[PDB]
Amino acid sequence: DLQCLCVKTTSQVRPRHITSLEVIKAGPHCPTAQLIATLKNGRKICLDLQAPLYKKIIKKLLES
Amino acid sequence: DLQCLCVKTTSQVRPRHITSLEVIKAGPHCPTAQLIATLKNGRKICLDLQAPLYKKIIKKLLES
Amino acid sequence: DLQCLCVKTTSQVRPRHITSLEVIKAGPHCPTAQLIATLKNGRKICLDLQAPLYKKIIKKLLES
Amino acid sequence: DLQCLCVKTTSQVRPRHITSLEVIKAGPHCPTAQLIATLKNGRKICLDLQAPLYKKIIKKLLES
């Protein structure tokens, strides 16, 4: 059995401090895609898939 | 406050299918560590704390 | 010290076959952005930072 | 793709410093378990297996 990781979702994130972004396909464990984002100082946080905000973030991660 | 990321945890994890563990330290961001398990099919789950589960999984990892 | 996780790039990927896709910013780990797609079979491939590929990939991974 | 993240280890670090600590198991990319450690500031160091420090760090981290 086993569950969704992302349910508590934040939008008080500085895109100028995200190191990874992981996009996981919705499936069996969770009926929605989950956007996990590793902040630079260690910690992770789930991102709002209803928020505009993951637009901004992927541009400045692919800009290199 | 919260964004602990892991709020429901688990034990329902077949040890031989977990490819990576992240032990994130607890902090002002969330009062408890998380044991985020990344499994071979991509799916990621937060295991349950303070148990024999972590010496189990960790030594199936500290080898092959 | 760490190096780039990716050492080749993949042009043939069947977009629906991916489960996770992580995007890692450029930094001391490696001067280039990196995109790593876990296939259904636990295979990890990396994709080219300017390919068409991830434009479909993040959409098909967001919807559902 | 085929890369070992850790090209060289990092034989000393204070356990009161590490936030995340990642245990990565062998497979097609590194025939070696790798133990990445993201320090309190941002930059990762890889701890090494067969050695007194990792038991100690994982302890510190888990009590939290």
Q: A18-46: b or e for each residue (b if 16 or more CB lie within 10 Å)?
A: bbbbbbbbbeebbebbbbbbbbbbbbbbb
For D49, the closest chain B residue by CA position comes to B62
The reply to whether residue D1 touches residue C2, judged by beta carbons under 8 angstroms, is no
The Cα–Cα gap between D25 and B59 comes to 10
A18 strand-pairing partners = A39
Among candidates A45, B34, A59, which has minimal Cα distance to C49? A59
The Cα–Cα gap between D58 and B31 comes to 17
Q: In chain C, which residues have their Cβ closer than 8 Å to the Cβ of D12?
A: none
Q: CA dihedral defined by B29, B34, B40, B41, rounded to 10 degrees?
A: -60
For D15, the closest chain B residue by CA position comes to B25
Note the maximum CA span of chain A: 40
For A27, the closest chain C residue by CA position comes to C64
Q: How many residues does chain D have?
A: 64
Of D24, D33, D61, the CB nearest to B63: D33
Residue C56 among known ligand-binding residues: yes
Paired sense of beta strands C18-24 and B44-47, if any: unpaired
The reply to whether residue B43 touches residue A2, judged by beta carbons under 8 angstroms, is yes
The Cα–Cα gap between B29 and A8 comes to 13
The Cα–Cα gap between A21 and A18 comes to 7
The Cα–Cα gap between C6 and C23 comes to 12
Q: In chain B, which residues have their Cβ closer than 8 Å to the Cβ of D33?
A: 61-64
Burial (CB < 10 A; 0-12, 13-18, 19+), residue B45, is buried
Q: Is D55 helix (H, G, I), strand (E, B) or coil?
A: helix
Q: For residue C37, give how far its alpha carbon lies from the nearest alpha carbon of chain D (Å).
A: 10
Experimental method reported for this structure: X-ray
Which of D38, D41, D45, D64 is the best mutation test for A, with the most CBs of A within 10 A? D38
Of A7, A29, A42, the CB nearest to B43: A29
Of B2, B29, B43, the CB nearest to A43: B29
Domains of chain C: 1-64 (2.40.50.40)
Burial (CB < 10 A; 0-12, 13-18, 19+), residue A59, is exposed
Resolution expressed in Å: 2.4
- Which residues of B are annotated binding-site positions? 55-61
Q: How many residues does chain B have?
A: 64
Q: In chain D, which residues have their Cβ closer than 8 Å to the Cβ of A42?
A: 19-20, 38, 40
| Break-preceding residues in chain B (C–N over 2.5 Å) | none
The reply to whether residue C40 touches residue B41, judged by beta carbons under 8 angstroms, is yes
Q: Is C60 helix (H, G, I), strand (E, B) or coil?
A: helix
- Which residues of A are annotated binding-site positions for heparin? 55-61
